[model samples]
Target chain A: GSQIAKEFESFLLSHLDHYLIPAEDVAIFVDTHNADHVMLLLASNGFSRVPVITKEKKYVGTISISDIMAYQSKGQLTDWEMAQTDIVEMVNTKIEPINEAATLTAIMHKIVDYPFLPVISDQNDFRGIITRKSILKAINSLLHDFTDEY
Target chain B: GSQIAKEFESFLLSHLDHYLIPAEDVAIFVDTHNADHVMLLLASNGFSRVPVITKEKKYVGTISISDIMAYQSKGQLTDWEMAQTDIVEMVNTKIEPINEAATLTAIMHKIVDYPFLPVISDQNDFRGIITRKSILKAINSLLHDFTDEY
Candidate 1:
């Protein structure tokens, strides 16, 4: 990253932990939702890329409509016949979750690359996710402060 | 777009007509490539977005498999019955073609938003398309030679 981009991120993450959109606000797929069910869920929900949780209520991985979209290509990218497929089976990416108490820098390394970072409690409960929109909001407020100062 | 985003685009498009990707090399959907053929075309070809040409060899619009993949959702986002759907019908946007003799500023306006600009001759014959990658390549060269002097 350029020093300029670096400087921007430095100011950008100033919102720190405040950027997290607590778990209750975000939608997630439970392991019980079959492939067809989850496909409908994802579609009706605007294809919001979501985390997959086991019946035990622990985050196992993340899934996007894009992932399911790829699997559709097998039937000539023409059919999604995997209705009997499990939701857990469809989630290919098991993103490591960061603890809720992680330092802003720990959060930074995790957040910069993915769409969202799952936050886990010490007991392994899914806390929530930190979104790119929040970071953009962070940057927005940083610029907003310039009006207050200058 | 924000003013910050707007400024970035201003500097980004400085490459001008240098951005054209000649029509001869681009993969396009012809009047004959059926839905199954196009689906395979998009998948094996790594989903490079393409323009659609009619039987008369006129550029009608553009397509991305994302468009086909979207149509899949009607069958639970599960099937592509679109086998009979014509190429021109699938292309939702009929992007206006820019004349080859157009000004750099005209090309600039046509681009910076869409992934490409389809170029047309004064006779309305298709000339070629300009791609975002070409613009990025132009930007790369600008940044590359900076080390030559600075």
Candidate 2:
């Protein structure tokens, strides 16, 4: 038999999620999207937080777990719950993020110094986050997957 | 004149809660101590978690309410029963940690990178942890105590 298989041509091509990596495709809500709509997305997905993006997909600040808690929604009516008509105006209060294209090491160092950095691109667009969780996931795979035959 | 006004330094030396400051003498437990006991301490002091020091007071790791709920006890026991065991043996099996001298700001960056990082000395001995809650407490003190003047 052959010694082994051939090398990988495209890393992500083979390893990327078959179901579109729904877990990875930054969940984004837009400025024109109502808080009610955003909350609907959150309720359906069970996310503690989500990124706010422009209709053009530009990066905006994050809607935090704490922020949601402050709003006090009851799946019915509340003062903070966005109406179907309200554009995600609450984005004005969002915390802007930083670029994500930097290498893993740089991201690690940056995350160490900052609470959270929203990943953006030179086009001034919202890219998916390069979060501490993502970075650790990479490190974890590296540590666990390497097993010497010796 | 009547009695002189006590100096600020004098008041802090007398009226301040010395227990609030980090000290070597604070009680510590191993990672495998009873969950109930840990809860007792946490509830009694209104802390979210506490450091698990080794036999030599070396930082083993920490035990939090989340950790307790997330961990699987040896006997498939309830959290209440698990609390009575040795926390160091039960939980701190292979915890990674950082140095005690790490800057408070820097530690915040590393916090979410992993569950928790035990603060240790060069000798790998456990020192007290600088928890996220504690950092917030410190910040809250600074903000609350000085904001009136601002």
Candidate 3:
């Protein structure tokens, strides 16, 4: 292993949560039953993927740009029909939520496999996401902590 | 510092390019001078941040959902006005690009600071992007590479 990585090991374990963006602060999710101008609203707001959650705020899956594109590409639904499609019906629910108490190592395990993952309470209540951006930010911050002398 | 991190380091160095998603394959960027429909198209395609590039294919900056929200919230532009604003006038251009020839270590160095970064050639031509997702995928693959008796 390189000297830099060897020296950087201690930094990651001690500072996992310092860079976490809490659940309430995250802005990319919506309730599953809302049937408003979903596409237009997301477009207008500049969001690519909108997470779908239960009324109880439990995450179900996500409604992504690709999903919408795939639906449109099939050409089965009219523009009006596409707008009428429910968020629940369109969500991709194959995701597994990470426990709030998960370690940094555990998060690393999942983050590599999923581009964006939901963080939830032990009882499955949705919190927020642990995105690739956040992780990189955390690691970046740690890298800066070291001086040139190190 | 830990055995897990130590083992993971070697994995990253060995399989760097294996995880890269080439620039031509990425679909989430817009021209720096693109119109409002560009944001809508990205939303329809399920991407949040639209990377902006010049006509000469030089990586410029990004236009994010929050940027649009802030633009709208300040009441500086009407919906119609927003649509008319060129991307060149709207992107956040503080980002730095990663070279196409960058090593995994080099990628790790910058990725910690930039959640999403563009990849460019030495000649400043747009290549692709290096996202946290790709890094995580590389790490995850390495973890799985170890069998029951590693």
lDDT of 1 by residue, B87-141 (tens): 6556746577787777554554445455577887767666678764554354344
Cα lDDT tens digits, model 2, A30-108, are 7676665565677577555577777778766666433543354433347454465343445434445554445433444
On DockQ, who's better, 1 or 2?
Answer: 1
> lDDT scores for all predictions?
0.63, 0.49, 0.64
- Docking quality of model 1: it rates as incorrect
DockQ ranking from best candidate downward: 3, 1, 2
lDDT of 3 by residue, B1-150 (tens): 244454644544554346556766776555544456775776676566657777777777777755666666676777778776776666677887777777766787777666567877888877778777777666555435433223
Using DockQ, give the best candidate's number: 3
Candidate 2 lDDT over residue span B1-150, tens digit each: 011112212322332122123436445665546666775676576444456776666666666544554555435677556655566544544556666556443454565454345566799776555443343343334323333432
How many clashing pairs does model 3 include? 5
**Models sorted by TM-score, best on top:** 3, 1, 2
Off by over 4 Å in 1: A1-16, A65-85, A103-112, A147-150, B1-38, B41-66, B69-87, B92-150
The alpha-carbon RMSD over the true interface for every model, in angstroms, is 12.7, 27.8, 6.5
What is residue A126's positional error in candidate 1, in angstroms? 1.1
Candidate 3: the clashing residue pairs are A65-B45, A65-B46, A112-B136, A140-B112, B23-B128
Winner on DockQ between 2 and 3 is 3
